Write a protein that binds this ligand. Structure first.
Ligand SMILES: Cc1cc2nc3c(=O)[nH]c(=O)nc-3n(C[C@H](O)[C@H](O)[C@@H](O)COP(=O)(O)OP(=O)(O)OC[C@H]3O[C@@H](n4cnc5c(N)ncnc54)[C@H](O)[C@@H]3O)c2cc1C
Ligand code: HEM
Ligand code: HEM
Ligand code: HEM
Ligand code: HEM
Ligand SMILES: O=C(O)/C=C/C(=O)O
Ligand code: NA
Length: 568
């Protein structure tokens, strides 16, 4: 067979997968995927037949109910989604190599003829609010608005939910939580505000940072009330105290928060549409929002009539061409992002009249795994790991800001360094077991041995760890001034993870006020248009602190949903 449908139709009728009229149920292919499941079982049952010791196409870290058509198309060869970040040994039937080729919004001007037909038609749906993007901010805004009594449609251009938020690991910052108090941490919204402003080099909009710090506990409470576990509180770079919240044991905050949000949206019967891209915000004759033109992958263009549109589309850190124009020093770097994080949501915001700000500030995460090409959480360092160069020495305060850590790593021999930790650090953060499972954390029972395996001066590394453990024991790092020294590296075996910087997060984006209203260049509100999450600018100034983006998307996502519902 040349394709999956041809294979099945050798023994099956068209309606084994299709509806009675033959029309595709919707752009999520809901009915069609139910038929795959009726014969093959759920994703979890299929995964029992495709086990590999350390990986499995059908049982991943992605949250929500991943549709089979996310990777298996019927009438044409299709791509494995995991290939966008990993290169696992897979043999999917009718596969084709991963290639992301998505037209820009500007390029979609070529469909002017089909777009005009869509716009001349009646709206396909008439609702109160449309949320664009199924990352943490968009689910938060959909739930919030629905809970306030608004009828929402939440759209997502990708085949799978959660954007980059599902990838988040280190935590969600918040101050003065009940969770901190149970771990005996003392903090305050004022101190979180202070750390954030200083970390962003005072470029941050202070009114936006006040919303971030003051709503932070409430956002933690809201998520927890919805079923989230945010009881583990760790340290991330640039924070005066531990305030990065995550599930018990140090599991990744991201996939968990998005799973909780999805489950809550499903419980509320929120109309969620996959493979549906927002293209153009429509405005009436007085310039207020009247709806949005969308492009369904399977159904074509159509528009939704609504009072409000909430853009929650994420950043543009996968788009190296846009990134290099703004910061030529990041040209050619690998990204930590999902494949659709290219900034089309910003183009939608701008075409609607929204202005952008702080676009030149682009964050590189200092620690991408060289071997795996994926982000290694900063929580590995916050929980006690050090960084060594190939000479087996420390060279930087490992919990300094991201700008300084990336430069210090790139200044080392080979333009990369190694995270070094022991079993005490490993046991303190369960996320570390995920790097070991990926095969990117070689181990040995001595540093001399570990060094020999990874090309690190073994005898200098041994000395380096003994010296660092002495500083931990005395409580002051006189070599690099790391202000938090939580553990000695002296339990069990040792591990090394080769790391280098990668493009991660875009601090700039659409200008919003404190009600998450999108504004134009004259600082005028565009009635009905909201923005929330990494697509906005002004919250994080020149450098975002680790943990502050998950805090931002919940707080601003929730706020946008409530304001949009009220506006109506
Ligand atoms: C690997 C990784 C780990 C991280 N860890 C942390 C952490 O621990 N703490 C922290 O503070 N931050 C962390 N960050 C950053 C944080 O995850 C993000 O900034 C992300 O959660 C922002 O969420 P968001 O909702 O704004 O956007 P995203 O979660 O990226 O979701 C936006 C969604 O919009 C969809 N979309 C985009 N354009 C359109 C369009 N035109 N039409 C329809 N849909 C569209 C995208 O496909 C995407 O699904 C991490 C980021 C990454 C990449
Ligand atoms: C889009 C929907 C579906 C998906 C993604 C899917 C997936 C697949 C895949 C990848 C294969 C292996 C192909 C090969 O080896 O070349 C397969 C085979 C098979 N499929 Fe499907 N399938 C779908 C729908 C269905 C339905 C509706 C039925 C039954 C009515 C079905 C029954 C089978 C059977 C019997 C086989 C052969 C192997 C076996 O006995 O399990 N599939 N399917
Ligand atoms: C000869 C039998 C079939 C016919 C005539 C048929 C017809 C079609 C048509 C016309 C489309 C495009 C619809 C549109 O763009 O609006 C489509 C798409 C689709 N069909 Fe089929 N179909 C058949 C068998 C199957 C089978 C056996 C499967 C699953 C194993 C399947 C699953 C799908 C899916 C998932 C889509 C969405 C796009 C894609 O994945 O290719 N169909 N079909
Ligand atoms: C319930 C949902 C799905 C169904 C029913 C389904 C069906 C199947 C089947 C029947 C096979 C062949 C297994 C065999 O050798 O007998 C297969 C293989 C595969 N599928 Fe799926 N699939 C689903 C979802 C997905 C998704 C969402 C992805 C990607 C994220 C994916 C990627 C693959 C890959 C890469 C292979 C080859 C596995 C390997 O080489 O280990 N599938 N699928
Ligand atoms: C269904 C698709 C995928 C599969 C089956 C898969 C598989 C895996 C596996 C086996 C690991 C090692 C730890 C573990 O067992 O979970 C891992 C880790 C990781 N993967 Fe994926 N992957 C998928 C897609 C992606 C994509 C598209 C991205 C990036 C956008 C990504 C980002 C990461 C990261 C950052 C890690 C490090 C550990 C963590 O943060 O949990 N993965 N993946
Ligand atoms: O877990 C991390 O290293 C990423 C945190 C962040 O981007 O805030
Ligand atoms: Na931004």
């Amino acid at each position: 067979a040349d394709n999956l449908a041809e294979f099945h139709v050798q023994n099956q009728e068209c309606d084994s997968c299709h509806t009675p009229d033959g029309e595709l149920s919707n752009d999520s292919l809901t009915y069609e995927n139910t038929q795959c499941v009726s014969c093959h079982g759920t994703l979890a049952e299929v995964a029992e037949t495709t086990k590999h010791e350390h990986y499995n196409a059908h049982a991943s870290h992605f949250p929500g109910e991943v549709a089979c058509t996310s990777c298996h198309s019927a009438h044409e060869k299709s791509m494995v989604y995991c290939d966008s970040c990993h290169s696992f040994d897979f043999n999917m039937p009718y596969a084709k190599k991963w290639l992301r080729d998505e037209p820009t919004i500007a390029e979609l001007a070529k469909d002017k003829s089909e777009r005009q037909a869509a716009l001349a038609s009646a709206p396909h749906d008439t609702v109160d609010v449309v949320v664009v993007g199924s990352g943490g901010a968009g689910f938060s805004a959909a739930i919030s608005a629905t809970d306030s009594g608004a009828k929402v449609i939440l759209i997502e251009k990708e085949p799978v939910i959660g954007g980059n938020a599902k990838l988040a690991a280190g935590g969600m910052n918040a101050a003065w939580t009940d969770q901190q108090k149970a771990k005996k941490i003392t903090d305050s919204p004022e101190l979180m505000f202070e750390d954030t402003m200083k970390g962003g080099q005072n470029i941050n909009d202070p009114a936006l940072v006040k919303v971030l710090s003051s709503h932070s506990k409430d956002s933690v409470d809201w998520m927890t009330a919805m079923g989230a576990d945010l009881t583990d509180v760790g340290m991330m770079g640039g924070a005066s105290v531990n305030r990065a919240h995550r599930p018990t044991g140090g599991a990744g905050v991201g996939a968990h928060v998005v799973q909780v949000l999805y489950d809550n949206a499903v419980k509320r019967n929120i109309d969620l549409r996959m493979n549906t891209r927002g293209i153009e915000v429509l405005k009436d004759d007085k310039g207020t929002v009247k709806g949005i033109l969308v492009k369904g992958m399977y159904k074509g263009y159509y528009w939704v009539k609504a009072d409000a549109v909430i853009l929650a589309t994420g950043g543009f850190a996968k788009n190296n061409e846009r990134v290099a124009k703004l910061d030529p020093s990041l040209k050619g770097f690998i990204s930590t992002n999902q494949p659709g994080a290219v900034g089309d949501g910003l183009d939608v915001a701008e075409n609607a009249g929204g202005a952008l700000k702080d676009m030149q500030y682009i964050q590189a995460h200092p620690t991408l795994s060289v071997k795996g090409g994926v982000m290694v959480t900063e929580a590995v360092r916050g929980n006690g790991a050090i960084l060594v160069n190939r000479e087996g020495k420390r060279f930087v305060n490992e919990i300094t800001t991201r700008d300084k850590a990336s430069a210090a790593i790139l200044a080392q021999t080979g333009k990369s360094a190694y995270l070094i930790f022991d079993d005490s650090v490993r046991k303190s953060l369960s996320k570390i077991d995920k790097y070991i499972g990926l095969g990117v954390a070689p181990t040995a029972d001595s540093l001399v041995k570990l060094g020999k395996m990874e090309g690190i001066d073994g005898k200098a590394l041994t000395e380096t760890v003994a010296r660092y453990n002495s500083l931990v024991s005395s409580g002051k790092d006189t070599d690099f001034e790391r202000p938090n020294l939580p553990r000695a590296l002296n339990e069990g075996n040792y591990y090394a993870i080769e790391v280098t910087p990668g493009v991660h997060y875009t601090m700039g984006g659409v200008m919003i006020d404190t009600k998450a209203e999108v504004m134009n260049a004259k600082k005028q509100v565009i009635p009905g248009l909201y923005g929330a999450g990494e697509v906005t600018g002004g919250v994080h100034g020149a450098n975002r602190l680790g943990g502050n983006a998950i805090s931002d998307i919940i707080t601003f996502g929730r706020l946008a949903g409530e304001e949009a519902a009220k506006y109506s």
